[PDB]
């Protein structure tokens, strides 16, 4: 069957990519925009540059240059799973459990679930990433299976054309420095950026590939001694002379800019608290990871990642069972392994 509404129709016109210069949202100004439908483009006010690795031996040669870990299966996203990708409201609330699939992309008052994020894999034990050529996928070492590695079948590597393999990776605890050059950011636009770059402890960004498998969790923090932010008044002083002159101390203002951002979110997405705003609470849970120590892995009908990888049959059991939808991210609810 075909659902009755196309997903584009379950997204509000104010959330679709911008079609003209006057509908540029904050990221379309900060990071820039090109119209996908006609004329119109804007150079982004934010430039990332000067990325340097500090560590010389940053790359995990797993043992020999020819070694390679076979890397789970990174499958393609399938939004046909309406209980995962469709929202019962344009607030982004999940579908209700127990309803038949036809309920999915069914009414214009349905919504999309919004921006897909890969929550940090909190609580991965010591040695989880260690010695990754070893097929520890079939034992619950400290309560987790080696979820990032394709299991062996019959004792041989499953280097099929569904998975990729990697000859190495950047080790954990390796460090990169990069710089952001910003232009004409307002205090909200700047405070939003600096909030991301000054998240509290154990908030982690997700980067690169393999994010469903736990890869690419990174901590971003600012180096204040190499940061030089001034408003246009402070640049008139800088360009006022060829002699050196005092830069302002931006560290007195960083908290003010973050508050300017935070109060704007409280005011436009009406809440008594900033942290209770649903996309803020959801985003926070993504960066922080789930607290209940349940493992993060694709749905399957068995604790172990069995080698044949029949992840589809959890969805079969769910269809005949309690037809549960993907829980709201800020609710931190785990799925059962038997959705029935």
């Amino acid at each position: 069957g075909l659902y009755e509404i196309a997903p584009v129709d379950l997204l509000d016109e104010t959330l679709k990519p911008a079609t003209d210069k006057k509908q540029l949202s904050p990221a379309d100004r900060v990071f820039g925009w090109v119209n996908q439908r006609g004329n119109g483009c804007y150079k982004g006010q934010l430039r990332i540059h000067s990325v340097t690795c500090q560590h010389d031996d940053a790359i995990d040669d797993f043992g020999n240059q020819n070694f390679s870990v076979p890397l789970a299966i990174l499958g393609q996203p399938k939004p046909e799973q309406a209980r995962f990708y469709c929202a019962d409201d344009r607030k982004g609330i999940p579908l209700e459990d127990g309803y038949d699939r036809d309920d999915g992309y069914s009414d214009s008052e349905q919504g999309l679930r919004g921006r897909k994020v890969y929550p940090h894999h909190k609580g991965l034990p010591n040695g989880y990433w260690s010695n990754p050529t070893e097929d520890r996928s079939q034992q619950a070492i400290q309560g987790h299976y080696q979820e990032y590695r394709r299991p062996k079948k019959d004792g041989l590597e499953q280097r099929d054309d569904q998975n990729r393999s990697v000859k190495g990776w950047v080790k954990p605890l390796t460090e990169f420095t990069f710089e952001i050059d910003v232009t004409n950011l307002s205090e909200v636009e700047l405070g939003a950026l600096l909030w991301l770059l000054t998240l509290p402890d154990l908030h982690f960004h997700r980067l690169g590939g393999g994010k469903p498998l736990g890869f690419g969790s990174v901590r971003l923090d600012i180096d204040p001694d190499k940061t030089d932010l001034r408003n246009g008044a402070g640049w008139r002083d800088y360009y006022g002379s060829l002699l050196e002159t005092s830069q302002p101390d931006f560290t007195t203002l960083i908290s003010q800019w973050i508050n300017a951002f935070q109060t704007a979110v409280k005011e436009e997405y009406g809440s008594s608290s900033f942290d209770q705003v649903t996309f803020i609470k959801a985003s926070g849970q993504s960066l922080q990871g789930f607290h209940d120590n349940a493992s993060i892995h694709y749905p399957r009908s068995t604790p172990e990642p069995k080698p044949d990888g029949e992840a589809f049959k959890w969805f079969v059991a769910n269809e005949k069972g309690r037809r549960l939808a993907l829980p709201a991210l800020e609710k931190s609810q785990s799925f059962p392994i038997k959705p029935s």
């Binding site: 540059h49 890969y118 640049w235 006022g240 060829l242």
Partner: protein, 258 residues
């Protein structure tokens, strides 16, 4: 790197400095009007545009006193070696020999790709992840191409003619140019394609100012600078320029009108 490109980035930063000081916006002006602002009209030049002032007819156009020369790499290829790259069809296929050939490392893809590196990029769809349909593209990033020095040429004689001979009127244009070079050295001016998208940042390790028959007060320009912040130029000279610069900022007249 065309000199048209190095001149447009320098002009863009020069104009941005001028507009920043005067707090003068560029959003309402069309592009020909955006270009036409003070000091840059003499340094970088202005379009020929005859205008009736009042009975008298005047060309607003003047050639740039500032001229930039195309920049070229240390790295050369035979005309067919590059055609082997332009006409490669498979990134992991025939492109690999083409780049190994053209970089001069026919047997070290690693060394070859430390010079010219193919980079794949995706746009990731915001609800699904994965990749947006069609939005897969590749850049040949010249990550390790080495370049020749950029060569700019300021016709002091041409400026002095615009300022009707007055060598005292040079100092603001010189001051602007040194401010543009301070930004260039401080990575504030990226060059070329993709500057916001992983490319275009340069490191300036030396600027050599080398004028001939300069007027006696501009002669302290004859300097090899390696500090980005111009502190290799004599402070008494940088203060003299700063004084004339500040005098102009206080009243930013059209300095070639007399």
């Amino acid at each position: 790197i065309p000199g048209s490109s190095i001149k447009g980035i320098l002009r863009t930063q020069a104009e941005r400095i001028i507009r920043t000081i005067c707090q003068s916006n560029g959003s309402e002006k069309n592009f020909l009007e955006q270009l036409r602002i003070n000091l840059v009209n003499e340094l970088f030049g202005s379009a020929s545009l005859s205008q009736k002032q009042n009975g008298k007819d005047i060309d607003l156009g003047k050639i740039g006193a500032l001229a930039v020369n195309d920049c070229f790499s240390s790295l050369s290829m035979t005309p067919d070696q590059w055609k082997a790259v332009e006409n490669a069809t498979e990134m992991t296929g025939n492109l690999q020999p083409a780049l190994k050939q053209a970089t001069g490392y026919p047997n070290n893809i690693s060394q070859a790709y430390k010079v010219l590196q193919p980079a794949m990029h995706v746009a990731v769809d915001r609800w699904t992840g994965g990749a947006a349909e069609g939005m897969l593209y590749s850049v040949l990033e010249p990550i390790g191409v080495t370049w020749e020095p950029i060569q700019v040429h300021l016709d002091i004689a041409r400026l002095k003619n615009y300022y009707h001979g007055k060598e005292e009127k040079l100092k603001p244009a010189i001051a602007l140019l040194l401010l543009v070079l301070r930004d260039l050295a401080n990575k504030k001016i990226p060059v070329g394609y993709g500057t916001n998208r992983g490319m275009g940042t340069i490191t300036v390790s030396q600027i050599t100012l080398n004028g001939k028959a300069l007027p006696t007060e501009l002669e302290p320009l004859n300097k090899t600078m390696t500090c980005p912040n111009l502190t290799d130029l004599d402070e008494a000279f940088r203060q003299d320029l700063s004084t004339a610069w500040k005098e102009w900022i206080a009243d930013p007249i059209d300095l070639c009108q007399q």
